[PDB]
Amino acid sequence: KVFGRCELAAAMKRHGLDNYRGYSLGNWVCAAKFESNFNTQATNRNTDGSTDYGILQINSRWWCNDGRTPGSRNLCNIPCSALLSSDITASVNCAKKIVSDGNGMNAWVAWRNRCKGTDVQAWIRGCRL
């Protein structure tokens, strides 16, 4: 499923991401825009053989099991395909674990490079929240 911007803002807010670990909602919407273009089905291979999955591009090197990242971890204890569903629960719950691990949103390269340091509240402008 490809979410609209305000559609995703509402879903992320209902799932408890607004102000999670101090990151306002616009941070999460911005991250999803630039990680996946709001597309739950997005997948992208990393050069180390791992793959990023879903609307927040969560990495099989550490966070989920995709059956083809030998020796990697599965910290969210899920198949990576769970991160591709139209239901964003698994992606949100795994993102909450990632952002709590000590590095915050710096885990998301697109957030670091395209959201951090910008007016991220713009990403929820015009939305009914």
- What positions carry a catalytic annotation? 35, 52
Task: Report the residue number, 106 or 129, with the smaller CB distance to Na ion.
Answer: 106
CA atoms of 38 and 6, how far apart (whole Å): 11
Compute the residue count for the chain. 129
Number of Cβ within 10 Å of residue 42's Cβ equals: 19
Minimum distance, C-beta of residue 129 to Na ion, in the bound complex (Å): 25
Minimum distance, C-beta of residue 91 to Na ion, in the bound complex (Å): 11
CA atoms of 42 and 7, how far apart (whole Å): 17
Minimum distance, C-beta of residue 128 to Na ion, in the bound complex (Å): 29
CA angle at 78 for the pair 74 and 79, rounded to the nearest 5°: 95
Task: Report the residue number, 8 or 98, with the smaller CB distance to Na ion.
Answer: 98
87 annotated ligand binder: no
CA atoms of 86 and 38, how far apart (whole Å): 11
Report 52-111 residues binding Na ion (CB under 5 A).
57, 59-60, 65-66, 68-69, 72, 74
Is beta strand 58-59 parallel, antiparallel or unpaired with respect to 43-45? Answer: unpaired
Q: How many residues bind Na ion (CB under 5 A)?
A: 11
> Which residues sit in the known binding site?
101
| Binding-site residue ranges for substrate | 101
Contact positions vs Na ion (CB under 5 A): 50-51, 57, 59-60, 65-66, 68-69, 72, 74
